[PDB]
Amino acid sequence: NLKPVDAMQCFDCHTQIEDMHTVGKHATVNCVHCHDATEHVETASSRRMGERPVTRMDLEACATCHTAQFNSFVEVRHESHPRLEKATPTSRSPMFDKLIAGHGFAFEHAEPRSHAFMLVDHFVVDRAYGGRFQFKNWQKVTDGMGAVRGAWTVLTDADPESSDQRRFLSQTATAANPVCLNCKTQDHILDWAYMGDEHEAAKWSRTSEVVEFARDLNHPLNCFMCHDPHSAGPRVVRDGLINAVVDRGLGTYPHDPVKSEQQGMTKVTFQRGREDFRAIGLLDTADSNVMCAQCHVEYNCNPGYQLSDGSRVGMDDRRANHFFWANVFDYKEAAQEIDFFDFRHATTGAALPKLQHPEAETFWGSVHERNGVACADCHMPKVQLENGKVYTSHSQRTPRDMMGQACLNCHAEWTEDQALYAIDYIKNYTHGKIVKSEYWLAKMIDLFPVAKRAGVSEDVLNQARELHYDAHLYWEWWTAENSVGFHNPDQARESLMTSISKSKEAVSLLNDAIDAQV
Amino acid sequence: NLKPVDAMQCFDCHTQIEDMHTVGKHATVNCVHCHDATEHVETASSRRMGERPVTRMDLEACATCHTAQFNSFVEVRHESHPRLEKATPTSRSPMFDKLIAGHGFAFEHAEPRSHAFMLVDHFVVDRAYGGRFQFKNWQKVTDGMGAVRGAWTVLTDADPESSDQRRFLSQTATAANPVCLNCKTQDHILDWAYMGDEHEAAKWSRTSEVVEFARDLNHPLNCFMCHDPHSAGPRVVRDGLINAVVDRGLGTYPHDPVK
Amino acid sequence: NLKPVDAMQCFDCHTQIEDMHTVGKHATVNCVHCHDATEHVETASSRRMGERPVTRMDLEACATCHTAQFNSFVEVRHESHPRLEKATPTSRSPMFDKLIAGHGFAFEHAEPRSHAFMLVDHFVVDRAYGGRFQFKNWQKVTDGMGAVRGAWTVLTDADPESSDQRRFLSQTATAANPVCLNCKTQDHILDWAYMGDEHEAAKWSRTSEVVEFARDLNHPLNCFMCHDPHSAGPRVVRDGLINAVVDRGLGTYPHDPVKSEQQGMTKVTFQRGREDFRAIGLLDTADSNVMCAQCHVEYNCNPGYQLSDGSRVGMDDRRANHFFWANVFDYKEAAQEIDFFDFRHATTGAALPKLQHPEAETFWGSVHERNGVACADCHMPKVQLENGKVYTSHSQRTPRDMMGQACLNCHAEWTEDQALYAIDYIKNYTHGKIVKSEYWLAKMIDLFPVAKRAGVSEDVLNQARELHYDAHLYWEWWTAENSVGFHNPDQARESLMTSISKSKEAVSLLNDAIDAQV
Ligand code: HEC
Ligand code: HEC
Ligand code: HEC
Ligand code: HEC
Ligand code: HEC
Ligand code: HEC
Ligand code: HEC
Ligand code: HEC
Ligand code: HEC
Ligand code: HEC
Ligand code: HEC
Ligand code: HEC
Ligand code: HEC
Ligand code: HEC
Ligand SMILES: [C-]#N
Ligand SMILES: [C-]#N
Ligand SMILES: [Ca+2]
Ligand SMILES: [Ca+2]
Ligand SMILES: [Ca+2]
Ligand SMILES: [Ca+2]
Ligand SMILES: [Ca+2]
Ligand code: NA
Ligand code: NA
Ligand code: NA
Ligand code: NA
Ligand code: NA
Ligand code: NA
């Protein structure tokens, strides 16, 4: 059985913790629930850690007092199809292989599934670790609670004796790097300096051997990513988000300075040896838009190249961990701002961006966002009980499973079927424009080999490559973004029509140039 | 927000509680969750209570950390038909009125329904308080969570100015007495001596005015009836049961001495 | 009403039948249930047949004493979509037409449906008989019991006055030949010599006019294909299977000599005029793996060409009726062993294999096969009754319709939804790799015309053709195989990654060669 410790003894040194813990709703929660610090207390000084205390990062540390929220979080949505490749005719991007050629996502890019699986899915996807990590067997794919208990309870490593990234299976890639893990787990929260910069107190950084880092990590989406364990108050912990909002002064709502002030973020820094080490962002309100934006954003978490001279930008560079914090129509400028692109297209040679799941930046300026609606209202609503204590559902999933709470309490004029119909109108329309955008991208791409072999000039090919950047950006935003336009239907429409326009321009350019060589 | 108290100071005078609390699974649960003892600590000695500390009896004192158990408890089973009289041809005892004639249950004996309603149902049944207590209106019969929050949030008293048992409706009885309440609530656990014997320290006893007692009671089936709040371990609190099992030496399983 | 005959009179001549009938569970079943032999008994000698007895091949011969098994067999699974073409974006092989160009399957290749329809579906598919045979009208497609009663109760022939294979509809082929019928019916079991070799006692053989043969055949999947009618014991009758297992000594489990001995096959030969004529394979156990492998295998049942010199291999050659009895990684060697390929690709010119439904060979070595599980456990389980005599379901179909019996009695740790989720994880992953394999095959194929027209050398084109063989094999196995990887997920993964690797090699080869000509 747990035996409480004297928190006043800790507070003698830990004044920041005192200030947070004594005031919030965890003022009665003893440190022993999450820390084993006996040897630490025997050896520490006011400025030197001494023996390092044990800190629990497992989600079951919160589940004995918050079982309802834990059990809701760990539920597996079986209707969220697992390991479903997006580059197929029945998924999100039928022509993805042709369009993404040259990028690691060509090796595998599946649709997302329930949050319990995020860390194991990261470890086992074919693009990440060369096939090094696999489920122990094909039964384990069902085991959401097991994944939550720990990744290494359900996975194997093909070679525990080596730590290099290499291919164990032929059609895999080794794109994983330490930055990725920040959106899968925060088990490393005490072992990683802010931004992954080199730091004498950090075991891990942007330049670490990612296979070694992986082996030290266990739990997905820790409860403390959104809730400070000491104050119980709302927060974020993701460095790239704090960097955008606070360090670069862009605010929580870059398009709305008033909402940014009302729903702001305060950066709190913790030190090692009286040097800044790590940071958190305390929120003014329990604002899920910003909580979810720790991960559901467009980012850099990877090496790339400079737009200016084509030189390599490695993991050592700050730009390898970057939140652009820009909507689709501001993105090209944001990428120019840091002089960065992701890959050269394998067929066209164009410098291209790689977009990823920009839900937060897409939601900005939408009708729902402008009306004060937030991610949680549609994706983790309050539970409705005939008789009971209300709590917030932590099963983050499509509103289709809980339409009464997610939509119909606000939209009293609609039945469930009417609300579903409105979602599908947008998704069907948007998907049609995604498909047409891909058709035109593909038509352009297929002209590049013909143009090159016919002797079309480098100047014309470069003009077409410049068009390819924009045609790509204004399409791929929407295959990356998970709502198929629902989050901002007018923006999707405008973007996708722009993509098509750019590809059509490039097709005309290249056809005319080819025809002139004949 | 709750601010913790120095439990070690309490333990200087409460060794009995110390020995339970420090060993069980509530060793880390601070006393402020269930007690307001500030004025008590200012005035007590080890031999003089001083000001009486307040003890929470509401079930929400436990629901903060044990929401799943609380929400499962308070659920209303709508399929358990409510206010269904047993002396009818389609229930348990078609000839009950003839057979029970002379007993108070002839006035009303319904089938049981969900636990959330036990205290309110005891208060409102036609055989208990002469019809003195009623739901505020006929809508309130659905409200299990409200009954749990407290009986007097959903009921009315026909005459707050009197405390005698009497008939307010013609075909009622006044069979309720203080012993009944021990199987409806334990809000009175610190105000009732063992067995309801007379005692200098007990506000309430077997011989109390049941209408006065009723007004001091709020919550059904308290969580601590089965779980010691200090050790978190399994227990019973009902005096009659302890008296049979232990005092009279009958054991927990009178037909099986080994068990 | 049936009147029994004196079986002892038959047994005077038919000692093999006596030995089987008197010992098994049909010892009390009189011959009149299946044979009308009165004139035969009047005219036969110990060595000459005399007048031929009538033998019932209809399944209703078994249905008066085994109605439960018959009615379960003839059930139509309406959820098994009928006449659904695989070369469509929503089915198994979105790029099949490009990849299979030059082969008859380009004319039509539908997904399988319920067993009742196998013979009629064979007769009416657009690739088989030039459109000669059709359902009497479009209502008849529903009539499973009617098809079982006889094909010619529900079909018409466009020209009863001719027996040649020809096109009656423009976009049909005439690929059917007599070997095909052995996996649709055994109505011809007394009229077909072992392997379809020429034989004086056989009405039909590999070289027969298939339209004439077709007209003599009526019933699908006869009950006696798995059960000897005389002993009632487990058996196979399919010649190609017996040839692989017994004649070529490969065993019932080629990868496991111990299991092969425990679960073996004994070849029993019947003669005409004291010359070997036909054969059956009695099984040691009621082993559905081997029963189902009469048909659910990769085979030759068709003419082809030799790998060595390109010469034609006709129906007259034994190789036209062949069970390779080899897993995907042993297949190329098995095809080299008989010096055979199926077709030349219409665009690339490569010699290619044609694969068909290799469920048995894929199942070998899988986790389930290694644990002693067999096809029937998942596809025709025992019925579970609260009160009743248990029998074996004969409705061979997906386990999704009977998950409690097919999966959950063994997998007590799972709910139905969890088990379904595990199936879909494998199928989704495998299908993604099938689609990627097709993308890379298509990319290679499309380079052949460009390379040929640019003047790339025959030596380079032949190197690419050799790669095409392997890229094709390691893809097509899996579009042919019906489990979308479930039967052997690790093997599918390895094969499909090999396909992609081979195509990528060919693409690089051809692009570099084209670029060198410019
Ligand atoms: C003064 C002698 C200290 C006492 C008393 C306690 N801690 Fe401490 N701790 C101390 C230092 C100098 C540091 C390094 C950071 C800093 O503020 O300079 C720490 C660090 C921790 C940590 C972080 C550990 C890690 O892995 O990074 C934890 C979780 C921690 N301390 C907890 C803790 C507890 C619970 C205490 C009471 C039992 C306690 N500390 C006392 C110095 C001192
Ligand atoms: C029991 C010993 C607890 C442990 C372990 C954890 N929490 Fe907690 N939490 C506890 C209490 C008694 C309360 C107050 C309840 C009330 O409403 O009065 C809380 C509160 C929270 C909250 C709400 C905070 C707010 O609204 O300001 C959150 C978000 C929360 N707790 C989160 C949480 C996390 C993430 C935990 C694991 C790190 C955790 N709690 C543990 C009691 C206990
Ligand atoms: C936060 C800014 C992220 C970083 C850094 C990385 N990932 Fe991610 N990932 C993130 C989200 C919000 C999602 C769900 C939404 C979606 O569009 O999928 C994902 C999903 C994945 C998946 C599952 C789906 C798939 O693509 O197969 C995998 C396998 C995955 N992520 C891997 C991965 C890798 C290898 C990363 C570093 C190169 C990486 N992620 C970083 C958020 C974020
Ligand atoms: C960010 C993605 C979150 C993670 C990770 C966790 N929770 Fe959460 N929690 C989140 C939100 C948006 C809210 C609602 C805030 C609002 O006021 O609208 C909550 C709330 C809670 C609470 C408070 C009581 C309630 O409303 O249910 C608790 C006790 C709580 N959360 C606990 C908790 C646990 C145990 C988690 C890990 C399993 C967890 N949260 C993760 C957002 C996020
Ligand atoms: C709720 C979770 C509680 C916590 C935490 C503490 N106490 Fe308690 N206490 C609680 C109840 C419901 C009662 C009523 C009696 C019962 O057995 O249920 C009590 C009673 C006491 C008493 C009176 C004992 C007696 O002589 O009759 C004392 C002296 C007391 N409690 C002290 C105490 C201390 C010092 C605590 C912190 C260490 C403490 N309690 C916590 C409920 C809860
Ligand atoms: C949070 C501040 C709590 C309050 C208020 C209450 N309980 Fe509790 N309880 C709490 C914890 C951290 C634990 C240990 C969890 C673990 O498994 O480690 C418990 C445990 C219990 C138990 C189980 C005891 C056992 O198995 O020995 C019970 C029966 C229990 N708690 C009951 C209970 C009651 C009735 C409460 C109101 C009087 C109550 N708890 C409050 C945390 C908290
Ligand atoms: C514990 C030994 C009890 C005592 C003392 C009293 N009651 Fe009770 N009551 C008890 C239980 C276990 C049940 C449910 C099972 C059942 O057979 O009903 C009840 C039920 C009631 C009801 C509801 C049903 C009904 O009869 O209408 C009422 C109105 C009720 N009890 C009233 C009541 C009165 C007036 C009591 C003292 C005279 C009394 N109860 C004592 C357990 C116990
Ligand atoms: C609006 C046109 C109503 C319709 C339709 C129904 N009810 Fe009603 N009900 C309505 C009002 C304005 C009130 C009084 C509210 C108050 O607190 O003053 C009620 C009351 C009831 C009651 C309580 C009756 C009592 O005597 O205490 C019940 C049990 C009730 N209503 C149930 C009910 C049912 C089941 C209905 C559909 C058959 C129904 N009501 C319709 C307003 C309206
Ligand atoms: C000896 C005079 C015979 C008697 C008595 C019966 N049969 Fe016969 N049968 C005989 C021969 C020589 C042959 C040819 C095969 C052989 O063993 O050499 C047969 C063949 C059959 C067949 C196969 C017919 C076909 O179409 O190929 C059947 C089904 C058959 N015989 C059945 C049968 C029955 C049921 C008899 C008792 C009524 C019977 N035969 C007697 C020789 C002799
Ligand atoms: C009635 C006159 C029968 C006819 C016609 C057919 N079968 Fe039969 N069969 C019959 C009996 C009395 C039995 C024995 C039942 C028992 O369990 O004792 C059987 C048995 C079978 C079996 C099981 C054999 C075994 O387990 O060893 C099979 C597979 C079987 N029968 C198949 C079958 C076939 C395919 C038939 C048509 C060719 C057929 N039977 C006809 C009775 C009768
Ligand atoms: C046994 C080794 C077989 C031979 C010889 C032939 N077929 Fe077949 N066929 C067989 C199986 C096990 C299946 C079901 C599984 C599947 O993948 O479809 C089939 C299916 C068909 C179908 C229906 C599906 C379709 O392709 O449209 C048809 C029309 C069909 N078979 C025709 C056919 C022809 C023309 C054959 C000789 C050239 C032939 N089959 C041989 C097993 C076997
Ligand atoms: C009576 C008013 C009818 C309605 C309503 C439907 N059908 Fe019909 N159908 C009808 C007749 C008289 C016939 C021809 C019968 C014959 O054998 O001469 C049919 C035929 C069909 C067919 C076959 C078409 C073919 O070209 O062979 C089909 C597939 C069919 N019917 C299906 C069908 C459906 C699905 C209906 C509801 C949408 C439907 N029919 C209505 C008469 C009538
Ligand atoms: C191979 C593809 C089969 C065909 C064709 C038929 N049956 Fe079958 N049968 C098959 C198996 C795998 C089994 C189970 C064997 C085991 O021991 O696990 C059976 C069993 C029977 C039985 C025995 C009683 C029972 O278990 O139900 C009978 C009587 C039977 N089969 C009859 C039968 C009929 C009438 C068929 C044509 C409609 C038929 N079988 C075809 C495999 C195969
Ligand atoms: C008992 C007769 C079984 C039947 C029926 C089904 N399965 Fe099975 N399965 C069984 C065993 C003994 C094992 C291996 C267990 C171990 O850990 O050693 C399995 C394995 C699986 C797997 C994993 C496959 C892999 O290659 O890792 C899966 C996905 C699986 N089983 C699913 C499954 C399904 C969906 C079933 C119904 C169609 C099914 N199994 C039946 C035993 C038995
Ligand atoms: C992840 N991207
Ligand atoms: C069939 N093939
Ligand atoms: Ca999903
Ligand atoms: Ca990006
Ligand atoms: Ca009841
Ligand atoms: Ca099918
Ligand atoms: Ca073949
Ligand atoms: Na989905
Ligand atoms: Na491995
Ligand atoms: Na009932
Ligand atoms: Na199907
Ligand atoms: Na016709
Ligand atoms: Na093309």
Q: How far apart are the first and last CA of chain B?
A: 47
Q: Is A59-413's fold the same as A414-518's?
A: no
- Mutation for C interface: A76, A171, A431, most C CBs within 10 A: A171
Ligand 13 geometric centre to CA of C405 (Å): 17
CA dihedral over C146, C149, C153, C158, signed as positive or negative: positive
Are A28 and B65 an interchain contact pair (Cβ–Cβ within 8 Å)? no
Q: By the 8 A CB rule, do B20 and B231 touch?
A: yes
Q: How would you classify the pairing of strands A299-301 and A275-283?
A: unpaired
Q: By the 8 A CB rule, do A332 and A275 touch?
A: no
Which residues in chain B have Cβ-Cβ distances shorter than 8 Å to A2? 25, 27-28
User: Closest Cα of chain A to C245: distance in Å?
Assistant: 31
DSSP string, A230-292: TT--BEE--HHHHIIIIIT---SSTT-HHHHHHT-EEEEEEEETTEEEEEEEEESS--HHHHH
> Does domain A59-413 correspond to CATH entry 2.30.110.10?
no
Every domain of chain C and the residues it spans? 1-58, 59-413, 414-518
DSSP string, C145-195: HHHHH-GGGTEEES-TT--S---SSTT------GGGGGGT--TTTTSB-GG
Buried b (16+ CB within 10 A) or exposed e, A124-146: bbbbbbbbbbbbeebbbbbbbeb
Half-sphere exposure in the Cβ direction for B171 (13 Å, CA): 4
User: Closest Cα of chain C to A191: distance in Å?
Assistant: 34
In the three-class reduction of DSSP (H, G, I as helix; E, B as strand; rest coil), residue C372 is classed as: coil
The resolution, in angstroms to one decimal, equals 1.5
Residues in contact with A510: Cβ distance below 8 Å, sequence separation at least 6, in sequence order: A444, A447, A448, A450, A451, A456, A460, A464
Q: By the 8 A CB rule, do A509 and A467 touch?
A: yes
Q: How would you classify the pairing of strands A54-55 and B133-135?
A: unpaired
From the CB of residue B9, how many other CB atoms can be counted at a distance below 10 Å?
Answer: 11
User: Closest Cα of chain B to A390: distance in Å?
Assistant: 9
Are C501 and A89 an interchain contact pair (Cβ–Cβ within 8 Å)? no
In the three-class reduction of DSSP (H, G, I as helix; E, B as strand; rest coil), residue C344 is classed as: strand
Which residues of B line the annotated binding site for heme? 10, 13-14, 26, 31, 34-35, 40, 62, 65-66, 115, 180, 183-184, 223, 226-227, 230
Measure the CA–CA gap between A317 and A392, rounded to whole angstroms.
Answer: 40
Q: For residue C209, give Cα distances in angstroms to A349, C20, C175, C192, C315.
A: 58, 35, 12, 14, 11
From the CB of residue A370, how many other CB atoms can be counted at a distance below 10 Å?
Answer: 12
- CB of residue C302 inside a 6 A radius of ligand 11: yes
Beta partners for residue B36, in sequence order: B54
In which residue are the tokens 């072999």 written? A453
Are A142 and C422 an interchain contact pair (Cβ–Cβ within 8 Å)? yes
Q: By the 8 A CB rule, do B163 and B171 touch?
A: no
Measure the CA–CA gap between B138 and B42, rounded to whole angstroms.
Answer: 47
Nearest CA among B68, B93, B143, B149 for reference residue B113:
B143
Measure the CA–CA gap between B237 and C338, rounded to whole angstroms.
Answer: 87
Measure the CA–CA gap between B238 and B242, rounded to whole angstroms.
Answer: 7
Beta partners for residue C204, in sequence order: C192
Known binding residue C10? Answer is yes
Known binding residue A184? Answer is yes
CA dihedral over B61, B63, B69, B71, signed as positive or negative: positive
Ligand 6 geometric centre to CA of A151 (Å): 29
Nearest CA among C479, C175, C501, C507 for reference residue C348:
C507
Minimal-distance CA residue of chain A relative to B144:
A387
Ligand nearest to the Cα of C295, by number = 11
Which residues in chain B have Cβ-Cβ distances shorter than 8 Å to A232? none
Measure the CA–CA gap between C257 and C266, rounded to whole angstroms.
Answer: 15
- Which residues does B contribute to its contact with A (CB < 8 Å)? 1-4, 22-25, 27-30, 32-33, 60, 63-68, 70-71, 74-76, 116, 143-145, 148
Measure the CA–CA gap between A377 and C404, rounded to whole angstroms.
Answer: 38
Are A97 and C436 an interchain contact pair (Cβ–Cβ within 8 Å)? yes
Minimal-distance CA residue of chain C relative to A170:
C497
Nearest-CA residue for ligand 3 atom 22 is A122
> Cα–chain-centroid distance for residue C112?
11
The closest CB to that of C94, out of A89, A141, A142, belongs to A89
Q: Which amino acid is at A365?
A: G
- CB of residue C201 inside a 6 A radius of ligand 9: no
Q: Which amino acid is at C502?
A: K
Minimal-distance CA residue of chain B relative to A28:
B4
Ligand 22 geometric centre to CA of A136 (Å): 25
Measure the CA–CA gap between C16 and A164, rounded to whole angstroms.
Answer: 68
The closest CB to that of C497, out of A89, A139, A171, belongs to A171
The closest CB to that of B74, out of A27, A32, A387, belongs to A387
- Mutation for B interface: A25, A387, A393, most B CBs within 10 A: A387
Ligand 5 geometric centre to CA of B229 (Å): 6
Known binding residue C416? Answer is no
Query: B67-74 and A67-74 are packed helices; what angle lies between their axes, rounded to 10 degrees?
Result: 90
> Cα–chain-centroid distance for residue B34?
17
User: Closest Cα of chain C to A347: distance in Å?
Assistant: 11
DSSP state of A82: T
Measure the CA–CA gap between A81 and B102, rounded to whole angstroms.
Answer: 68
Ligand 21 geometric centre to CA of C166 (Å): 23
Q: Provide the residue count of chain B.
A: 259
Nearest CA among C404, C411, C468, C410 for reference residue C442:
C468
Known binding residue C230? Answer is yes
Which residues in chain A have Cβ-Cβ distances shorter than 8 Å to B67? 66-68, 389, 391
CATH class assigned to B1-58: mainly alpha
Ligand 15 geometric centre to CA of B123 (Å): 61
- Mutation for A interface: C93, C368, C429, C441, most A CBs within 10 A: C429
Nearest-CA residue for ligand 14 atom 38 is C407
> Does domain C414-518 correspond to CATH entry 1.20.140.10?
yes
Nearest CA among A236, A238, A235, A226 for reference residue A179:
A238
Minimal-distance CA residue of chain A relative to C495:
A170
Query: A458-480 and A328-337 are packed helices; what angle lies between their axes, rounded to 10 degrees?
Result: 120
Measure the CA–CA gap between C290 and C375, rounded to whole angstroms.
Answer: 9
Residues in contact with C408: Cβ distance below 8 Å, sequence separation at least 6, in sequence order: C414, C415, C416, C419
Q: By the 8 A CB rule, do B109 and B87 touch?
A: yes
Residues in contact with A418: Cβ distance below 8 Å, sequence separation at least 6, in sequence order: none
Measure the CA–CA gap between A440 and A417, rounded to whole angstroms.
Answer: 34
Ligand 9 geometric centre to CA of C42 (Å): 11
Which residues in chain C have Cβ-Cβ distances shorter than 8 Å to A84? 428, 432
Beta partners for residue C344, in sequence order: C351
Half-sphere exposure in the Cβ direction for B142 (13 Å, CA): 5
Which residues in chain C have Cβ-Cβ distances shorter than 8 Å to A142? 414, 418, 421-422, 425
DSSP string, A148-198: HH-GGGTEEES-TT--S---SSTT------GGGGGGT--TTTTSB-GGG--
The closest CB to that of A389, out of B4, B22, B63, belongs to B63
Q: By the 8 A CB rule, do C468 and C81 touch?
A: no
Q: How would you classify the pairing of strands A275-283 and A265-272?
A: antiparallel
In the structure encoding, which two tokens stand for residue A462, read together? 């470069």
- CB of residue C374 inside a 6 A radius of ligand 14: no
Return the HEC string of chain B.
CCCCCCHHHHHCCCHHHHHHHCCCCCCCCCHHHCEECHHHHHHCECCECCCCCEECCCCHHHHCCCHHHHHHHHCCCCCCCCCCECCCCCCCCCCHHHHHCCCHHHHCCECCCCHHHHHHHHHHCCCCCCCCEEECCHHHHHCHHHHHHCHHHCEEECCCCCCCCCCCCCCCCCCCCCCHHHHCCCCCCCCECHHHCCCCCCCECCCCCHHHHHHCCCCCCCHHHCECCCCCCECCCCHHHHHHHHHCCCCCCCCCCCC
